[PDB]
């Protein structure tokens, strides 16, 4: 954590020093950061991967090009799926879903919040579950709990919850 968080922020600094150049260069480093698995903070490095895989949807030209490949690298990291590979990263991944949900007050709640019901589900499609609405439901219920649900996080959840289920 004195090195990887100093390197993931450096990867964020590589993401800061990015039009797409280091975003192409650290894409090789992020896909090979998955090779640095099998550690106690490897689930945190997978969290450092999956948040970068959540941030792989941000640039969405060469990083979303790396995203499903990183999800395949997460699948390469998935020798056998685990509950910490299922659950403890998920609210941390939903924390990244709670990151952009702070500035999610645009007039596209039928579109962008349904895209938030899709881009989160695309990461769940990167997780590739069949009950990916309902299997993520109790975690999202824990995540909408972790959301303040003052004015903007609530209806963005509940209408997407009305999208994913009844």
């Amino acid at each position: 954590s004195s090195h990887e968080v100093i390197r993931a922020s450096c990867v964020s600094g590589f993401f800061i020093l990015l039009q797409q150049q280091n975003s192409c260069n650290r894409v090789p480093k992020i896909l090979i950061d998955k090779v640095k698995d099998d550690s106690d903070i490897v689930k945190k490095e997978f969290a450092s991967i999956l948040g970068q895989l959540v941030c792989t949807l941000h640039g969405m030209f060469y990083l979303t090009s790396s995203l499903t490949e990183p999800f395949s690298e997460h699948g390469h990291v998935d020798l056998f799926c685990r509950n910490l590979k299922a659950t403890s990263q998920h609210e941390c991944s939903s924390s990244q879903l709670k990151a952009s949900v702070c500035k999610p007050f645009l007039f596209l709640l039928k579109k962008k919040i349904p895209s938030p019901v899709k881009l989160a589900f695309i990461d769940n499609l990167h997780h590739l579950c069949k009950h990916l609405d309902f299997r993520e439901d109790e975690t999202d219920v824990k995540a909408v709990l972790g959301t303040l649900l003052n004015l903007m996080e609530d209806p963005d959840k509940d209408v997407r919850v009305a999208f994913s289920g009844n």
Partner: protein, 362 residues
């Protein structure tokens, strides 16, 4: 005891060396066609028993390839095409004797490869009359290694499609895929024989390619492209070759649909979808290797196959509607575009298929 029958294997190779000293005789092989007629003396005499015997040359040993080696000696020089006919009586007689060795008890497997060596060496009509003989005598209810020899029968017809107008390809257009539905099947070499059967599907042209294929075979081949990595293993260069043959075989409809576009295609985009991702299962995996210098050529092969897949990347997008996907193959298409923009920069190659794929993946 001084030595076992490995000394006879040391003698059969020495008999093949006697066949090789016969192959070290000279040019054009009318005398060896007469030795093929002297083989036809034996080859007519095998089924002349028709009782508990075999073709004694094939029943002599297994590794002794004098049936090929004398035919290799018969490949001395072309004088003229009756050498490519004299062993035809040696061909179909032992083939009917191998057909009289039906169900392949313990010695009838090795016959068809000797026949394939007879098919590959020299047949003017010595394959075509053999194809006229095999039209009257063929049984295809095959097994594991027998799938390879059935592809050796498929190896014959494209080799028999050579002469001037191919002279029996329309007759081979009768010999169609009606028995070829036995894929999703035996192992990697048989899948390479299925890729050879796909090389036979990269053959039997517009006389029958607009009839037999219909884009439901390539989807069954897209199931085979799934099967080749999954229904067996140890196909590291083999499925790579099977893709490289499919790189020829998918491009075998290049001038066909770009003549009048008949093509019988029902599912014209299903096979191109999963195979291009299955390309990225090796080529983006080779772009995960991402080396510049080739290993020796196995890196250079799949990359040229990726350069062949670069044409295949330009292929479906130039006619059909790209990015009309449903699954995460479109998400893998960006990873294929990640494999593209890597390999496009890494090409230093033909700029036509480069810039087209630069607009196809993007």
């Amino acid at each position: 005891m001084a030595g076992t029958s490995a000394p006879g294997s040391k003698r059969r190779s020495e008999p093949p060396a006697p066949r090789p000293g016969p192959p070290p005789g000279t040019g054009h092989p009318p005398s060896k066609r007469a030795r093929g007629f002297s083989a036809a003396a034996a080859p007519d005499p095998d089924d002349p028993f028709g009782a508990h015997g075999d073709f004694t040359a094939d029943d002599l040993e297994e590794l002794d390839t004098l049936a090929s080696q004398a035919l290799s000696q018969c490949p001395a020089a072309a004088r003229d095409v009756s050498s490519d006919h004299k062993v035809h009586r040696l061909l179909d007689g032992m083939s009917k004797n191998p057909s009289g060795k039906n169900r392949e008890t313990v010695p009838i497997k090795d016959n068809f490869e000797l026949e394939v060596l007879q098919a590959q060496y020299k047949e003017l009509k010595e394959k075509m009359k053999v194809m006229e003989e095999e039209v009257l005598i063929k049984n295809g209810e095959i097994k594991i290694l027998r799938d390879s020899l059935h592809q050796t029968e498929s190896v014959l017809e494209e080799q028999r499609r050579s002469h001037f107008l191919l002279e029996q390809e329309k007759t081979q257009a009768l010999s169609d895929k009606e028995k070829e539905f036995s894929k999703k099947l035996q192992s990697l070499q048989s899948e390479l024989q299925f890729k050879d059967a796909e090389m036979n599907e990269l053959r039997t042209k517009l006389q029958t390619s607009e009839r037999a294929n219909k884009l439901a075979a390539p989807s069954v081949s897209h199931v085979s492209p799934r099967k080749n990595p999954s229904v067996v293993i140890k196909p590291e260069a083999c499925s790579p070759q099977f893709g490289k043959t499919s790189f020829p075989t998918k491009e075998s409809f290049s001038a066909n649909m770009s003549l009048p576009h008949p093509c019988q295609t029902e599912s014209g985009y299903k096979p191109l979808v999963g195979r291009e991702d299955s390309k990225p299962h090796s080529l983006r995996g080779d772009s995960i290797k991402q080396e510049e210098a080739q290993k020796s050529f196995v890196d250079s092969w799949r990359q040229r196959s990726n350069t062949q897949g670069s044409i295949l990347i330009n292929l479906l997008l130039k006619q059909p509607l790209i990015p009309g996907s449903s699954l995460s193959l479109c998400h893998l298409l960006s990873s294929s575009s990640e494999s593209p923009a890597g390999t496009p920069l890494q090409p230093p190659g033909f700029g036509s298929t480069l810039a087209g794929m630069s607009g196809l993946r993007t």
